[PDB]
């Protein structure tokens, strides 16, 4: 996992790769790791896939209930509290490293949440197997109050570093821009990796597969 | 749960609920049984012949095990309960003890069950 998150002048940029592995084999070439929490809050997930999924879904649900009862737009601190308290209650057995980003009535907020339940509120964060590379890119080329396209470039650059330098990351770069009045969920923001084109035709023509038994069954 | 005393003593020393249950038995279809030398016979009366009803699904005679059979009189649903619990007990006896079951034993079990229901809360 090679996710990341940054805070700029008008809001927050979230980034993530799309490689999912089992063993040392790529299982999913295109996996969405940027999750919907609330219409103003998104969260990148790294670690145990099912854990990040179910956790992010559960907290999203609880926040929907929350805002439904309050009638207001959900705060980021709330998602942070829910996440950290749940994760801490399970003492790290839920393999969920998270980058929580969102815009509030109080402004832009970015948290990093480790599976043991600890959180850090920082202007920029990275998580995943490729987090060191991305963090290097951030530490090298970050400045406070960036413009939107600048921040998008920085984050995509970080995720790219993760993609090419870490064997755990690969494929595409997904971004999510969140300002005080806009939500750009750019899915394929960049496809820096492409499968080589086939040089042959290994197409098997009808009949080459021997059959022992057949049974057709009509439907409706 | 429902912690309420249902069957209690009356000032004259009667258990009214039990007597009422006996009156409910009195309204049941007649059920007689006799014991012979090499055979034993059980017969039940007024089976409420509607001729549109399947006779099999309303029999008042039920087998508890290969050794013991049983007829009843009164509330049929309650009888279903008692009969099933009796069958289960008949099997459990085989489980805990290699030997099958005596008629006296399963009778004692049924009786104890009924009494337990005469002295339990709710």
């Amino acid at each position: 996992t090679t996710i990341a998150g940054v805070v700029y002048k008008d809001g927050i940029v979230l980034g993530a790769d799309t490689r999912a592995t089992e063993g040392m084999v790529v299982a999913d070439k295109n996996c969405s790791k940027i999750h919907f929490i609330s219409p103003n809050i998104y969260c990148c997930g790294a670690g145990t896939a099912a854990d990040t999924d179910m956790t992010t879904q559960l907290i999203s649900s609880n926040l929907e209930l929350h805002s439904l009862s309050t009638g207001r737009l959900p705060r980021v601190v709330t998602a942070n509290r829910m996440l950290k308290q749940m994760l801490f209650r399970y003492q790290g057995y839920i393999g969920a490293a998270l980058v929580l980003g969102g815009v509030d009535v109080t402004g832009p907020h970015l948290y990093s949440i480790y599976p043991h339940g600890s959180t850090d509120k920082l202007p920029y964060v990275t998580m995943g197997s490729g987090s060191l590379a991305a963090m290097a890119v951030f530490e090298d080329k970050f400045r406070p109050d960036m413009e939107e396209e600048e921040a998008k470039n920085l984050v995509s650059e970080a995720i790219a570093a993760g993609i090419f330098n870490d064997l755990g990351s690969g494929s595409n770069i997904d971004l999510c821009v969140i300002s005080k009045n806009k939500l750009d969920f750019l899915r394929p923001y960049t496809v820096p990796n492409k499968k080589g084109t086939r040089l042959g035709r290994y197409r098997c023509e009808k009949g080459t597969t021997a059959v022992l038994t057949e049974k057709i069954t009509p439907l409706e | 749960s429902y912690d309420r005393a249902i069957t209690v003593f009356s000032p004259d020393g009667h258990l009214f609920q039990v007597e009422y249950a006996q009156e409910a038995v009195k309204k049941g279809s007649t059920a007689v049984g006799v014991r012979g030398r090499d055979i034993v016979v059980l017969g039940v009366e007024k089976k409420s012949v509607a001729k549109l009803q399947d006779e099999r699904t309303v029999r008042k005679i039920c087998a508890l095990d290969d050794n013991v059979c049983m007829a009843f009189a009164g509330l049929t649903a309650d009888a279903r309960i008692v009969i099933n619990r009796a069958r289960v007990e008949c099997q459990s006896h085989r489980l805990t003890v290699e030997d099958p079951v005596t008629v006296e034993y399963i009778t004692r079990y049924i009786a104890s069950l009924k009494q337990r229901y005469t002295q339990s809360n709710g």
Binding site: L122, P123, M135, A136, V137, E139, D140, F164, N165 | -
Partner: protein
């Protein structure tokens, strides 16, 4: 060595136009303790090559002794032949693998920089005898932090000037000082050109800490 004691962390290397540059902090750590904050982890092996070392400092001192002796031994003959950087790299590979196979490794990971016959050399050697050549090298946490930066530049511009490479190195040392808990804000830069090997004195890295005042918002 089965259990390393006093150790040094990352070592960086990168080729440039007509030379090679290498960096390494001057820290010897005893676990989490910054025990010896003034030691050189860079050696001048003759005039065409140079060596930076990560890992157990004592074993590095041993290799320093041995290599120094080899260079002296060769220089005594004066037969017009000398050890090329590639040769030194090959020898070091052989040695590390030999110790590895004796189940008694020299707990070191090394970067050899050099310049001979107009070509820039940069070689990596493990404690297991894993060795290779590359335009950029980073040992330890550098390999996770500095190397991604180095590759980003080298794949956008293969040839760098000496000043460019030096800048890149400085920035990488800054990143390492930021993120590596066993590093130190006091490092050395060695350089090979046709003019020879030059090791520059105690350098510091400028640090920005403005993100300290971004707790609230």
């Amino acid at each position: 060595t089965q259990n390393p004691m006093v150790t040094g962390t990352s070592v960086l290397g990168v080729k440039f136009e007509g030379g090679v540059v290498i960096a390494a902090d001057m820290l010897g750590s005893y676990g989490s303790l910054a025990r010896f904050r003034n030691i050189s982890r860079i050696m001048r092996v003759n005039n065409s090559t140079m060596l930076g070392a990560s890992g157990d400092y004592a074993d590095f001192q041993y290799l320093k002794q041995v290599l120094g002796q080899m260079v002296i031994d060769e220089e005594l003959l004066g037969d017009g032949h000398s050890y090329s950087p590639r040769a030194i790299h090959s020898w070091l590979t052989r040695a590390m693998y030999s110790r590895r196979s004796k189940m008694n490794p020299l707990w070191n990971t090394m970067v050899i920089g050099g310049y001979a016959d107009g070509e820039s050399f940069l070689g990596y050697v493990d404690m297991l005898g894993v060795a290779y050549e590359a335009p950029s090298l980073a040992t330890g946490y550098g390999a996770y932090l500095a190397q991604p930066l180095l590759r980003e530049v080298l794949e956008k511009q293969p040839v760098l000037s000496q000043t460019e490479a030096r800048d890149l190195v400085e920035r990488c040392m800054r990143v390492l000082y930021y993120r590596d808990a066993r590093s130190y804000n006091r490092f050395q830069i060695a350089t090979v050109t046709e003019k020879g090997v030059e090791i520059e004195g105690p350098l510091s890295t400028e640090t920005n800490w403005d993100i300290a005042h971004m707790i609230s918002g």
